Ligand binder design. Structure first.
Ligand SMILES: Nc1nc2c(ncn2[C@@H]2O[C@H](COP(=O)(O)OP(=O)(O)OP(=O)(O)O)[C@@H](O)[C@H]2O)c(=O)[nH]1
Ligand SMILES: C[S@@+](CC[C@H](N)C(=O)[O-])C[C@H]1O[C@@H](n2cnc3c(N)ncnc32)[C@H](O)[C@@H]1O
Ligand SMILES: Nc1ncnc2c1ncn2[C@@H]1O[C@H](CO)[C@@H](O)[C@H]1O
Ligand SMILES: [Zn+2]
Length: 361
């Protein structure tokens, strides 16, 4: 039942900016945005962004039967959407390159099966899975004959110019396509954007309706989600506007823990971080992991156990950046930890840390 899987997803905090300076330098080196993402394995974007939370009214008003997810990788965002809207069908696209997922592995794990994905991009070439290519847009209706009422794009492009290439092709499709033109101009593209320079105009006849600043976005970044439509063009958000909104959330809000614990998922993340790690993670479990060690792999294992021991011995606090800064700055081996563990391992470490923090008291 998709509605029961929704309790594994944490509540989202965000700010909507419809179309003084606040600063706080958090002395953090870890990707703490994954703190409440312990229930998800291959991807976890759904813990950060949600269609019901951000564009609930638009979802209700347009009432799409089919949603188009492009640059959707393992499909966790699509999976949360499938839990929020149990009757909606999906068209999935993601760049086929073998660097990331081009099959919705996380959607499959969360939902159980792919019956609601009517088009998963089976038999498509690298070119026809690429959102910056015209052929990708020309083949978007090979299964679904429903107009692109709402298109979702979470693609992380190799170059900044690729975002514009994608937006131009979305506009060229919705203004040419027999299916989409028949529906009209009330069509939307909800896309991930990294805010940089100001006075950067959107392509001709592409208009931003709102800018969404998510609590779950990387603190050092400038990521945001823009709701785009057809109409007289305006400017993209710049780094400055996004910083104030993002700093307020970081300073004032706590991360919500998921209502329910997904034990199979938590165990899958624990074993992925340290092979053989069991739940509950206590003094007994960490001493057992230490005893198994008695090399490069043992050095990495010791670094992990030392951090989990520090979390175990740490006092309980609220899930916020002030507490995260305290956790890092009370740990004497911080620089050795970031030096020893890679980006993927550190991300797994934060999910497991988050599970431990939520489990306290
Ligand atoms: N490798 C990996 N990436 C994930 C996983 N779950 C989510 N992500 C990524 O994490 C992102 C969360 O947004 P951010 O905080 O903006 O990004 P980031 O580039 O992942 O972050 P940092 O780890 O802080 O460098 C998602 O959009 C995904 O790209 C996961 O299990 N593994
Ligand atoms: C942030 S991940 C998407 C995560 C997804 N929302 C989830 O919940 O699993 C970004 C994805 O964009 C893909 N991508 C990168 N460039 C792309 C392009 N040109 N066209 C389509 N997808 C692209 C990457 O392969 C990657 O899977
Ligand atoms: N969705 C996007 N919106 C804006 N810029 C992007 C996007 N994806 C990647 N980039 C930019 O591409 C650059 C090179 O990978 C990065 O510095 C990043 O800012
Ligand atoms: Zn169309």
């Amino acid at each position: 039942d998709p509605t029961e899987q929704l309790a594994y997803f944490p509540k989202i905090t965000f700010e909507r900016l419809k179309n003084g300076k606040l600063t706080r330098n958090y002395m953090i080196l870890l990707p703490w945005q994954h703190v409440n993402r312990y229930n998800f394995v291959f991807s976890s974007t759904g813990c950060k962004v949600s269609l019901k939370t951000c564009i609930g009214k638009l979802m209700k008003d347009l009432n799409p039967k089919v949603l188009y997810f492009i640059g959707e990788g393992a499909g966790n965002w699509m999976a949360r959407t499938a839990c929020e809207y149990p009757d909606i069908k999906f068209v999935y696209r993601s760049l086929k390159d073998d660097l990331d997922h081009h099959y919705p592995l996380e959607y499959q794990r969360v939902i159980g099966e792919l019956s609601r994905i009517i088009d998963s991009g089976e038999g498509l070439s690298m070119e026809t899975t690429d959102a910056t290519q015209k052929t990708h847009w020309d083949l978007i209706h090979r299964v679904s004959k429903d107009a692109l009422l709402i298109t979702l794009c979470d693609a992380e492009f190799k170059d900044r110019d690729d975002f514009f290439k994608m937006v131009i092709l979305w506009r060229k499709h919705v203004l040419s396509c027999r299916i989409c033109t028949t529906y009209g101009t009330d069509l939307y593209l909800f896309a991930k954007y990294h805010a940089k320079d100001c006075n950067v105009k959107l392509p001709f006849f592409v208009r931003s309706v709102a800018t969404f600043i998510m609590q779950g976005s990387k603190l050092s970044g400038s990521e945001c989600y823009i709701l785009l439509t057809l109409g007289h063009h305006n400017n993209l958000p710049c780094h400055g506007e996004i910083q104030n909104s993002k700093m307020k959330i970081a300073v004032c809000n706590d991360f919500y823990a998921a209502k329910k614990l997904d034990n199979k998922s938590i165990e899958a993340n624990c074993k992925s971080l340290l092979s053989g790690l069991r739940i509950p993670i206590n003094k007994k479990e960490l001493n057992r992991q230490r005893r198994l060690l008695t090399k490069w792999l043992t050095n990495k294992a010791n670094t992990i156990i030392d951090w989990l021991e520090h979390i175990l011995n740490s006092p309980k606090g609220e899930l916020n950046y002030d507490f995260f800064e305290a956790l890092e700055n009370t740990y004497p081996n911080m620089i050795k930890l970031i030096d020893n563990l890679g980006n993927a391992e550190i991300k797994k470490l934060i999910k497991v840390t988050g599970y431990m923090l939520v489990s306290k008291k």
